[PDB]
């Protein structure tokens, strides 16, 4: 039996909205330490990693480790049936043939109870070696979303050049070209060991920014030749990290 109660149920609503466009199906690894999800998109160009720590929940119990296979579109649909101030409880029996989801409000007048079928997935897990990066940019999440949206109307790739004093985003296509310069100051801060210059597919960045409602800040971590990390903190709980392989 697994059971986790989250009073700030809107966190789960936003997590699923931030996932369902990038990936269809994923395995939720539950253990006594928390919830972990790790999945590559079908094209193997990006990977998303979700961490929700045990201690972030209001009640949390894992009698035994589980790997639930979930259609994220279906779970997304169910979570749209929760109000933004609902208390959300997740709950899975020994068999784990279904995931139960309970939506409540402190006044308790509407209680909703959903049962969704799980599925069998090759749970293929993978690891990320904790590194430091040449450049780490912390900036408002809304600003980064706007940059990625605007530049995607210029071209389909963005060159991210990071220096000690600022970060630039550049794109070009048939219309012409464009460059957006951000200065270190809604703070923009840059921790740089060395300069970097990387190119990334804008279509994937615009999937990542569906996580923007989870945090007013976003962090970009870059080094030569390695995937970009785009991380949104889920306050008092964990994070949503997106990995994007550079071009060439």
């Amino acid at each position: 039996m697994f059971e986790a109660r989250l009073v700030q149920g809107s966190i789960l609503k936003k997590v699923l909205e931030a996932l369902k466009d990038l990936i269809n199906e994923a395995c939720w690894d539950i253990s006594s330490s928390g919830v972990n999800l790790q999945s590559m998109d079908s094209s193997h160009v990006s990977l998303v990693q979700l961490t929700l720590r045990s201690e972030g929940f209001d009640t949390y119990r894992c009698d035994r480790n589980l790997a639930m296979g979930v259609n994220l579109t279906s779970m997304s649909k169910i979570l749209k049936c929760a109000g933004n101030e609902d208390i959300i409880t997740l709950r899975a029996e020994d068999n784990a043939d279904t995931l139960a989801l309970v939506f409540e409000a402190p006044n308790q007048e509407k209680v909703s109870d959903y049962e969704m079928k799980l599925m069998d997935l090759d749970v293929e897990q993978l690891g990320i070696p904790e590194q430091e990066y040449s450049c780490v940019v912390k900036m408002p999440s809304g600003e980064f979303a706007r940059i990625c949206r605007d530049l995607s109307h210029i071209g389909d790739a963005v060159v991210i050049s990071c220096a000690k004093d600022g970060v630039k985003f550049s794109a070009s296509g048939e219309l012409g070209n464009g460059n957006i310069k951000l200065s270190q100051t809604e703070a923009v801060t840059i921790e740089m060991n060395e300069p970097v210059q990387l190119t990334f597919a804008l279509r994937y960045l615009n999937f990542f920014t569906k996580a923007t409602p989870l945090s007013s800040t976003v962090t970009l971590s870059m080094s030569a030749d390695v995937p970009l990390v785009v991380e949104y903190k889920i306050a008092d709980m964990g994070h949503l990290k997106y990995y994007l392989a550079p071009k060439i």
């Binding site: 193997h44 160009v45 993978l126 990320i128 995937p227 990995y243 392989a245 550079p246 071009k247 060439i248």
Partner: peptide, 8 residues
């Protein structure tokens, strides 16, 4: 355009 298990 690269891919990812390539990287891990």
């Amino acid at each position: 355009q690269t891919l990812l298990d390539l990287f891990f």
